[PDB]
Design a protein around this ligand. Structure first.
Ligand SMILES: CSc1ncccc1C(=O)N1CCCC1
Ligand SMILES: CSc1ncccc1C(=O)N1CCCC1
Ligand SMILES: CSc1ncccc1C(=O)N1CCCC1
Ligand SMILES: CSc1ncccc1C(=O)N1CCCC1
Lengths: 237, 300
């Protein structure tokens, strides 16, 4: 059924699964019109579809043209997400298709269930975890490819870089969620922490630097401090 | 006017005939119900005094044969039987009427309630939902499960209602997923009406039969069927005007007849609030919405 803290380790077993986050599919800026009314302008978005065991991020870029002439866009966005995830599953060989898809928001259950009726053996699951995947657009290279897109496009990045050569997928997911939680709570500071040392380069093909094991410990501690810091600033603690 | 004689009443039982219920005491000189209106299906149903478990009963149409009730002390229930000897039957009834051993179907003349509850219900369609082809009447009890319930266990004893599943490949056209899920008109009009039921009368007949089974037997599966068939119409943006007007009348009389004190065991809060207040047809069921709001405003 639902994915929570009791069954957290199931994410890293050998049954293929994907997380789907739709919080950046339909993105707008709100502005005033010449007549003093309010209007929205859509900007490019993305579906965040992640294998938490391997780090494979299948980033489907949602170009603003898909909204043209459509109504009820927040509702359409959930069905467009489900359509694209179903299309991705069908494109994958049978032995690569997921056994479970975990949606980060419960409003995705029915749209994805309906689009996946042809796959009765794939379980569609919600989660009780509050995952910080909305902050994926705070990863500079991901935000860049989304904003530059002139047409629908799928892009592939490993969201763990080469970490799995040295750590397990449990630890890698934990690092990722800590980095994203920090970028979500204070993006400026988080980015300051990550690139304050010009000798650790963010490598061309990597989202975060080439930190050594010891440097990741320092980074991870600085990120917890930031999260705790912001928690205190927020709540006056 | 037709008659269903009883051989005897050896165990204390509440007997119902359509919307009327009455008590028969153990070994009371009861020998049936006379003056049953011709032209309608009817249901004669039972709840034993010593075990209110298993309400059960029989759907029948006196035009299709001569039927009587006889208690079976081995299987412990009142059974419907057909008498093939016409002159034997007429002679039996006449003696029981002369001795005034039969209660009278008490049809008030102003009253169209039973017609309005069974307008589209036909014996031939009942007998396809309830499969026991050697009899002209159909047995139903509270515990019988529907074909759907058994997909999700004895098939000879099932209620074969038409399966209605909103998240099913039958309900959803490849490539129209959002369209078909949010507006169920394709499923209602093409799959169900044109395809399975053939016409709205047959659809309403199954809807009305499901309600009556749910209310008279407290059959949970029947209740699920009734609400599913309501929701399918209310959740369709394109419904013929005559179907909406007839549905409003059908539901009005069903809600009017429901025992006030069973509205917790026969009415689904989600379906009714959705149907009356959120659905495409939220404004098309004026009679049903008014009686619901005045009779069961808690549920809403
Ligand atoms: C970053 S996506 C990725 N990464 C490394 C190797 C393959 C893929 C990929 O597109 N995949 C499609 C199904 C199997 C994996
Ligand atoms: C067959 S109706 C019947 N039978 C036996 C005793 C009374 C009635 C009767 O007039 N009824 C009207 C209200 C409920 C029952
Ligand atoms: C009309 S459904 C009904 N009627 C009378 C007694 C019980 C029920 C009921 O809610 N049920 C739910 C589980 C099976 C039975
Ligand atoms: C006719 S509705 C029905 N019938 C029998 C068993 C379950 C249901 C039911 O409520 N369902 C909800 C989703 C699909 C099944």
């Amino acid at each position: 059924g639902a994915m929570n803290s009791s069954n957290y380790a199931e994410l890293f077993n050998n049954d293929i699964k994907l997380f789907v986050d739709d919080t950046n599919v339909y993105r707008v800026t709100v502005h005033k019109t010449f007549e003093g009314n309010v209007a929205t302008k859509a900007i490019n978005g993305c579906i965040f579809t992640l294998n938490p065991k391997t780090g494979h991020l299948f980033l489907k870029i949602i170009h603003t043209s898909v909204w043209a002439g459509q109504k009820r866009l927040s509702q359409l966005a959930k069905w467009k997400t489900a359509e694209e995830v179903s299309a991705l599953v069908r494109s994958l060989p049978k032995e690569e298709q997921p056994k479970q898809i975990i949606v980060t928001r419960k409003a995705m259950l029915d749209p994805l269930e309906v689009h996946m009726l042809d796959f009765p053996n794939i379980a569609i699951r919600p989660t009780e975890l509050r995952l910080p995947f909305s902050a994926a657009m705070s990863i500079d290279k991901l935000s860049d490819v989304v904003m530059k897109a002139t047409e629908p496009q799928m892009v592939l990045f490993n969201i763990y870089d080469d970490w799995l050569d040295r750590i397990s997928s449990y630890t890698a997911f934990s690092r990722l969620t800590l980095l994203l939680r920090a970028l979500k709570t204070n993006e400026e500071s988080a980015k300051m922490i990550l690139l304050s040392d010009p000798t650790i380069t963010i490598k061309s093909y990597h989202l975060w630097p080439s930190f050594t094991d010891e440097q990741w410990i320092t980074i991870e501690s600085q990120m917890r401090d930031l999260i705790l810091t912001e928690y205190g600033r927020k709540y006056n603690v | 006017m037709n008659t269903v004689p009883f051989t005897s009443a050896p165990i204390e039982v509440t007997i119902g005939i359509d919307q009327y219920s009455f008590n028969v005491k153990e070994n009371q000189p009861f020998h049936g119900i006379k003056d049953i209106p011709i032209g309608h299906v009817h249901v004669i149903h039972f709840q034993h005094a010593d075990n209110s478990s298993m309400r059960y009963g029989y759907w029948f149409d006196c035009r299709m044969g001569n039927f009587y009730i006889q208690y079976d002390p081995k299987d412990g229930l009142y059974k419907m039987m057909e008498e093939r000897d016409g002159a034997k039957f007429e002679n039996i009834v006449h003696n029981f009427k002369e001795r005034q051993m039969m209660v009278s179907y008490p049809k008030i003349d102003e009253d169209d309630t039973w017609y309005n509850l069974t307008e589209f219900v036909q014996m031939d369609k009942i007998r396809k939902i309830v499969r026991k082809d050697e009899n002209q009447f159909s047995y139903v009890d509270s515990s019988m499960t529907t074909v759907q319930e058994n997909e999700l266990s004895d098939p000879a004893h099932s209620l074969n209602y038409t399966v209605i599943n909103f998240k099913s490949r039958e309900a959803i056209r490849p490539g129209h997923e959002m369209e078909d899920f949010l507006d169920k008109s394709y499923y209602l009009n093409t799959v169900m009406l044109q395809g399975i039921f053939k016409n709205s009368s047959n659809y309403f007949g199954e809807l009305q039969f499901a309600f009556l089974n749910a209310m008279f037997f407290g059959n949970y599966g029947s209740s699920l069927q009734w609400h599913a068939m309501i929701e399918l119409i209310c959740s369709s943006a394109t419904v013929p005007k005559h179907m909406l007007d007839k549905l409003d009348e059908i539901l009005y009389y069903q809600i009017k007849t429901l025992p006030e004190q069973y509205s917790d065991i026969l009415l689904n809060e989600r379906v009714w609030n959705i149907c009356l207040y959120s659905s495409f047809q939220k404004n098309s069921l004026h009679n049903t919405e008014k009686i619901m709001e005045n009779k069961y405003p808690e549920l809403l």
